[model samples]
Target: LSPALQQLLSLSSQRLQLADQVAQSKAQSGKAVQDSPREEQQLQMLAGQAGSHGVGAEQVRLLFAAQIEANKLVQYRLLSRPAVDLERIRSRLNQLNLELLRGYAPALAELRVDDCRPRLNQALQRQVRVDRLDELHAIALSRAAGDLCHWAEL
Candidate 1:
């Protein structure tokens, strides 16, 4: 995998790891795990900025939607299980989201449809092994990357 791809995967792993903190904060505040309106707003922001990054707006939207879903999955699982700051966690999440977009832009622009899925799968497998992610987190990570090759299906 290219460095950019590696960086993107690393960012994704970081995002998933933060779910623990997010869950703690949300549980303490009595907030629901799913925030559809906030998610939609983030997607819109990403879509609007996609053009400048040389990625399709719809593709960006799909990619981030999967990511958001993955994050929610972890949060929901943990709800089945404290005093952290929701705002701070959210701010960090927003930063990671933007970094993910920028890190993945090169792959989004350069990877051919034929190569996208295989390469992405390989990278994800490596990430799973390197991060030593548990079953739930591995599944969440896969879900997060589910839309990375959306064009291949079209």
Candidate 2:
């Protein structure tokens, strides 16, 4: 596997972990599962970066949409659970996002979304559970993997 593919696998794992944290923290604080404002802000910032980088806005938008939905899946399943360390999770999530950006190809033509899917899951199966909300979010995020680049097929 390429370094990009490995980074994506690492990135997906981090996203799922952060989703669990979002679920736990929100439940403890009595907050809604959906944080529309934050999601919008994130998407907008990402779209701007995508534009600057010559990546497609629509592709970035769709990838974030799936991410937010996957996050909500965790929140939905873990509602009412006790809070975890929100700051810690957020910090790590930010780090992971930076890592993902660094890992992406400079050119869209260089991305290998299709080749990475089976490899990602094959590796993921060894590291995580494959049921319920976990499986749901994992699959959703995996599908979104194809949309991670501007030239990627939707």
Candidate 3:
């Protein structure tokens, strides 16, 4: 597999299971579904990952489709709310950012390095924790742009 594939696999590999953990956390705490953008994105992302991997989308459709139900649950969860734990979000974003770097950052001299990791990760974490309500706004931008400019696609 290409490095890009490796990075994506590394990051996405943990996502569904992590989201399920959060789901369990909510249930155990009687928290209910608070806001579901994450949940919906989680479902869609999981589905896309499945399809991308040629995993047979139909088999996973129901799993991803559960976002609709989770959406409704979010509305209910919103009625009673507490502070969001931003640390968790940045943690997740950090992973996503590093993966993007590994997956896409073109082979240009400027693109490859260890420093970019921390800088990019911090920037991405800021984008997630402070800049916007949209959890994936920055990442969606990067993904839309495809691989980094210098990195040749396989």
Candidate 4:
């Protein structure tokens, strides 16, 4: 893989891994897939933070919306994969989420907006055989990549 592709995959794999944990937590809590208030708070915070890097707030909003959907997709998929240990996954979710946000925002913001469609398409193709949910996830993932890069000054 090219450097761009590699970075994207690394970031996305982390997100997906974190998503698995989130899915398990939601399952244990008996919560709905959508959490609008929490989601919006995070989006607002991300947009506020991205402003410092000259990555547009709206872009962060869109990007995070896609990422949120992707996480929800993971949650939905986990409903059928009964073997995963929910308790163990839940234990790691919070710290992983914190680490990802703290470490990767700038690197993600640095990605080339023009490169995202091809990069995400290729990355998703390599990572999974897209079922219906995976197909939706792929589109959202690509959009998220593009949105984060778009309007980035870097």
Tens digit of lDDT per residue, candidate 2, span 68-133?
A: 676676668767443488888878876765555445443233454556445555545533453333
Number of backbone collisions per candidate, in order? 0, 0, 1, 0
Model 3, C-alpha of 77: deviation from truth (Å): 17
- lDDT values of the candidates? 0.80, 0.60, 0.40, 0.58
Give Cα distance to truth, residue 88, candidate 1, Å: 1.3
Across 81-121, the per-residue lDDT of candidate 3 in tens digits comes to 54345359447744753453344322223335546444344
Per-residue CA lDDT of model 1 for 1-154, tens digit only, reads 5566666777888898899888888887888988789889999988899878767788788878888888999989988961787788889998998887776676565355567877888888888999999988888888887766664343
Best by lDDT: 1
lDDT of 4 by residue, 15-112 (tens): 66566666666777787878789788877867787656544567557656666676777768776678456566644544444443454455554455
Against the correct fold, how does model 1 do in TM-score? 0.88
Clashing pairs in 3: 106-151
For model 3, the stretches where C-alpha displacement exceeds 4 angstroms are: 32-90, 105-154
Candidate 3, backbone clash total: 1
Model 2: CA > 4 A from native = 51-54, 80-83, 106-151
Indicate the worst ten consecutive residues by lDDT in candidate 4: 128-137
Candidate 4 Cα errors over 4 Å, as ranges: 80-116, 126-154
Alpha-carbon RMSD of each model: 2.2, 4.3, 13.4, 5.1
**Alpha carbon deviation, residue 121, candidate 3 (Å):** 28
Model 4 steric clash pairs: none
